[PDB]
Write a protein that binds this ligand. Structure first.
Ligand SMILES: [K+]
Ligand SMILES: [K+]
Ligand SMILES: [K+]
Ligand SMILES: [K+]
Ligand SMILES: [K+]
Ligand SMILES: [K+]
Ligand SMILES: [K+]
Ligand SMILES: [Mg+2]
Ligand SMILES: [Mg+2]
Ligand SMILES: [Mg+2]
Ligand SMILES: [Mg+2]
Ligand SMILES: [Mg+2]
Ligand SMILES: [Mg+2]
Ligand SMILES: [Mg+2]
Ligand SMILES: [Mg+2]
Ligand SMILES: [Mg+2]
Ligand SMILES: [Mg+2]
Ligand SMILES: [Mg+2]
Ligand SMILES: [Mg+2]
Ligand SMILES: [Mg+2]
Ligand SMILES: [Mg+2]
Ligand SMILES: [Mg+2]
Ligand SMILES: [Mg+2]
Ligand SMILES: [Mg+2]
Ligand SMILES: [Mg+2]
Ligand SMILES: [Mg+2]
Ligand SMILES: [Mg+2]
Ligand SMILES: [Mg+2]
Ligand SMILES: [Mg+2]
Ligand SMILES: [Mg+2]
Ligand SMILES: [Mg+2]
Ligand SMILES: [Mg+2]
Ligand SMILES: [Mg+2]
Ligand SMILES: [Mg+2]
Ligand SMILES: [Mg+2]
Ligand SMILES: [Mg+2]
Ligand SMILES: [Mg+2]
Ligand SMILES: [Mg+2]
Ligand SMILES: [Mg+2]
Ligand SMILES: [Mg+2]
Ligand SMILES: [Mg+2]
Ligand SMILES: [Mg+2]
Ligand SMILES: [Mg+2]
Lengths: 146, 68, 50, 101
RNA sequence: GAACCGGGACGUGGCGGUUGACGGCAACGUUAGGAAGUCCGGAGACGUCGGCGGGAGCCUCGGGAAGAGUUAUCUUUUCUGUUUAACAGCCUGCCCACCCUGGAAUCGGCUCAGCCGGAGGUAGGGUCCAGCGGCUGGAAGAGCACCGCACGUGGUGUCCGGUGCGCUCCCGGCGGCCCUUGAAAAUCCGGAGGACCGAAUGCCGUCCACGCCCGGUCGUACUCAUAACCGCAUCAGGUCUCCAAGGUGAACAGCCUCUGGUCGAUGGAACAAUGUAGGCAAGGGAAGUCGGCAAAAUGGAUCCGUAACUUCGGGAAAAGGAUUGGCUCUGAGGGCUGG
RNA sequence: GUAGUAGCAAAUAUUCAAAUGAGAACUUUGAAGGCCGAAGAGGGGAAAGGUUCCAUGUGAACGGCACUUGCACAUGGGUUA
């Protein structure tokens, strides 16, 4: 007894693929009598036609490995395939630094810790690659003001 | 669909000759009065349940009132 | 294709009507020599040319 | 604060389980502060004739209680007959029911 | 069920008459708020590359609740989901542009990069523009999940956050490139002009709101291909394009997986020669052969180092050398609030 | 004649149980083991085809083995602005 029609209709009614349709192997005769979507829908309620669960694909391993990477594991030279630029462009690092340093200079000017004359001087030195991070810029400002 | 903000305005549109029906939708935090007109479905939201009952019995006779 | 002219669709309809077996009672007529439909067409074997 | 209930009526009446045993399982296996069995003042387990009650002084996951109850059923080879189901009446209660085979 | 568009017709209300509205210093705002021939502008309407910024969908992390999987041991764990359309109103106001005040060297502002300012910067306060942004209506009554009762019907939930040189698409703005400068028209909007026109207050005008009526003809199944097209065929060939998950990794490389699809290539038994495809091999190392043909060797990344020659740009990954797993740690590089 | 000979060999792969049938390595269901691995063997469309779409049934022929099978054959149904 061919059940091709019932499996096709069950897939459409269940809104799933034909591979996820389960037709009760012990009720082939009962299922074979359903030739309409109304009949299929009734069989779904009765439990003779069931949508099987999705095949398992867990992310536990991926999440577990990300924890190890967050601690610095698997990050040695033997685990690197792209160039340092490919892994993280130098332009990206430069953009981060300027936005951090320019943000820091604006807030100091707004709070009047530095005047516009000192802001301009520090602004051009930041663009000139003088200060490599937030800490050194703060120390230079304190030293210059003293 | 348009929203009516004033109960007075809702009553005026409920008396229109093209108002086919009114439906009462009672949610868990307010009551919605929906009146079907020719072009738009106007909806009025009344948070106070007690204040909604007064409007319910103030609708013009002959207008099909339904409870949802 | 799905996009087709009215004229072409009409021609295709006539070809479908002509693609049938001869009635059985034709072969029982007096002095009959028509054995079968000699102009049968299958969509995959011979193309319509239009 | 949180208080959850495990309504064990259908199996207790049919002598399918021992409500006292489930109380012991929850007390030993419940983890407070990351360590099992350290209920302390935070977590208290009180049983009745046909109902188990779990109260917590801080945030307590309801699904965590289901995880432990299901584990207890598996250890007693009764999962194929029993199943933990939430109650439509109360949102802090789990009920033990049978499969409609 | 809820909207919209193009036509047709009149009615009610509203609006204007200082005959053709009002507000704002201004940029402009408001729902209406004359007008003919003629005239003018705009939209439609446009290359390519690169960097940034914004929006949407997806991916991804945590918590809450629902079901499922695992459970001798371990696992507050693993998996599935956890929804919100056009359209209408209100709010928001990106990146730019624009307006008012004010008048700048001790020059300042400012981008990743530019760049901007007495032709008016910074600053202070505004206007406008985008939206695939927010809220509400639409709309939970739907959808989905789950639990019941019957064999249609009821109940519960659909919640609260984080993250980014991520991916796809859209948009913004800027820059590079040309002896290359990268369509047209239909259609629509706006403007200049003011011939002509009402009322002494009832007529006239009205792109406003609401109500009423109308909607031709043809195409629409299916395949779109290792079987629906062409190649004489159910031919390993040929045939334009859209959507595009997780892991590894620089990577729509290769390798493995989820959704979806599929096991369709006539089968069975033996394991000779010869063959085709894939390999390996002591010692020697091109002696083989027309010829290193074929194969082998090299290969990613980090650090060091790099000659002749040169059109000074290259040569260059020249050459040569070192390092690379796992595990447990240390240091450095940020954001938002609080005077 | 050649001759029941050349030949059926790319695209990893099938196995178990049951049902149906005169007849099952090849149809259908279930279970397992594999593959495509999102520039797909997935989901659509433009050309081109023209009913191949769907249901039921089937003597032969055809689907280069076989078939209970079907893009084959027979009957009917199906494309709404
Ligand atoms: K639309
Ligand atoms: K169609
Ligand atoms: K082909
Ligand atoms: K051999
Ligand atoms: K040689
Ligand atoms: K096509
Ligand atoms: K049309
Ligand atoms: Mg990169
Ligand atoms: Mg650079
Ligand atoms: Mg052909
Ligand atoms: Mg011809
Ligand atoms: Mg133009
Ligand atoms: Mg270039
Ligand atoms: Mg972006
Ligand atoms: Mg300003
Ligand atoms: Mg809403
Ligand atoms: Mg609902
Ligand atoms: Mg693209
Ligand atoms: Mg004018
Ligand atoms: Mg179609
Ligand atoms: Mg198909
Ligand atoms: Mg296709
Ligand atoms: Mg030909
Ligand atoms: Mg990576
Ligand atoms: Mg890849
Ligand atoms: Mg050797
Ligand atoms: Mg050797
Ligand atoms: Mg040697
Ligand atoms: Mg030699
Ligand atoms: Mg020789
Ligand atoms: Mg060679
Ligand atoms: Mg050289
Ligand atoms: Mg032979
Ligand atoms: Mg061969
Ligand atoms: Mg063989
Ligand atoms: Mg093969
Ligand atoms: Mg096979
Ligand atoms: Mg492969
Ligand atoms: Mg694979
Ligand atoms: Mg692509
Ligand atoms: Mg055959
Ligand atoms: Mg078919
Ligand atoms: Mg046929």
């Amino acid at each position: 007894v061919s059940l091709k029609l019932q499996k096709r209709l069950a897939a459409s009614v269940l809104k799933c693929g034909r591979g996820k349709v389960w037709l009760d192997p012990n009720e082939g005769n009962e299922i074979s009598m359903a030739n309409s979507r109304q009949n299929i829908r009734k069989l779904v309620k009765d439990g003779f036609i069931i949508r099987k669960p999705t095949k398992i694909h867990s992310r536990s391993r991926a999440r577990r490995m990300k924890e190890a990477k967050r601690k610095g594991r698997h990050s040695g030279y033997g685990k690197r395939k792209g160039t340092r630029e490919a892994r993280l462009p130098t332009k990206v690092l430069w953009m981060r630094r300027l936005r951090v340093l320019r943000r820091l200079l604006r807030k100091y000017r707004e709070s009047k810790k530095i005047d516009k004359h000192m802001y301009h001087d520090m602004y051009m030195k930041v663009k000139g690659n003088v200060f490599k991070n937030k800490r050194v810029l703060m120390e230079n400002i304190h030293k210059t003001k003293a | 669909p348009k929203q009516i903000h004033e109960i007075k305005d809702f009553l005026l549109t409920a008396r229109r000759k093209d108002a086919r029906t009114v439906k009462i939708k009672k949610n868990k935090d307010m009551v919605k009065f929906k009146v079907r007109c020719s072009k738009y479905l106007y909806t009025l939201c009344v948070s106070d349940f007690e204040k909604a009952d007064k409007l319910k019995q103030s609708l013009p006779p002959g207008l099909s009132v339904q409870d949802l | 294709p799905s996009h087709k002219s009215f004229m072409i669709k009409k021609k295709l309809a006539k070809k479908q009507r002509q693609n049938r077996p001869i009635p059985y009672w034709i072969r029982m007529r007096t002095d009959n020599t028509i054995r079968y439909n000699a102009k049968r067409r299958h969509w995959r074997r011979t193309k319509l040319g239009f | 604060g949180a208080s959850f209930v495990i309504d064990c009526s259908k199996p207790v009446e049919d002598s399918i389980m021992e409500i006292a045993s489930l109380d012991k399982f929850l007390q030993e296996r419940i983890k407070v502060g990351g360590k099992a069995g350290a209920l302390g003042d935070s977590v208290t387990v009180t049983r009745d004739k046909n109902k188990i009650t779990v109260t917590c002084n801080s945030t307590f996951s309801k699904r965590y209680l289901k995880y432990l109850v299901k584990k207890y059923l598996k250890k007693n080879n009764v999962r194929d007959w029993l199943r933990v189901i939430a109650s439509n009446k109360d949102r802090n209660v789990y009920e033990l029911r049978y499969f409609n085979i």
